[PDB]
UniProtKB/Swiss-Prot annotation:
Interacts with GAPDH and STAT1. It comes from Homo sapiens. GO terms for cellular component: cytosol; intracellular membrane-bounded organelle; nucleoplasm; nucleus. The chain holds residues 17 to 114 of 165 of the full protein. GO terms for molecular function: RNA binding; translation initiation factor activity. The gene is EIF1AD. Residues 8-80 form the S1-like domain. This is Probable RNA-binding protein EIF1AD.
């Protein structure tokens, strides 16, 4: 069993995981990296059959699949500047990335 788990907003499931985009060859796939320094590729949901706005560095939630194609996991949702922060407060956001938002900033870089 388990204890009352938190799930007020879109939160990474047990199998799901948060990664960061790196580059896209164009096809219906995207290369991301985990918090444990692990680069891999992901597939696009059969439901998101459209031209979604995806960029490099963008953090998304992918889920691993059983013994199937040469794909590790598939995108679940697109985290926004806000979401990311939320997960950080709730205590879910990864550490390997945690040291990213701190530096990142909107507008002219003071430093």
């Amino acid at each position: 069993g388990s204890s009352g788990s938190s799930g007020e907003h879109i939160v990474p499931s047990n199998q799901q995981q948060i990664v960061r985009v790196l580059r896209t060859p164009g096809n219906n796939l995207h290369e991301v990296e985990t918090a444990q320094g692990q680069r891999f590729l992901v597939s696009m949901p059969s439901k998101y059959r459209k031209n979604i706005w995806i960029k490099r560095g963008d953090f998304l939630i992918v889920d691993p699949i059983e013994e199937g194609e040469k794909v590790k996991a598939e995108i679940s949702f697109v985290l926004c500047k806000d979401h990311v922060r939320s997960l950080q407060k709730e205590g879910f956001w990864p550490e390997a990335f945690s040291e990213v938002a701190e530096k990142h900033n909107s507008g002219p870089s003071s430093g």
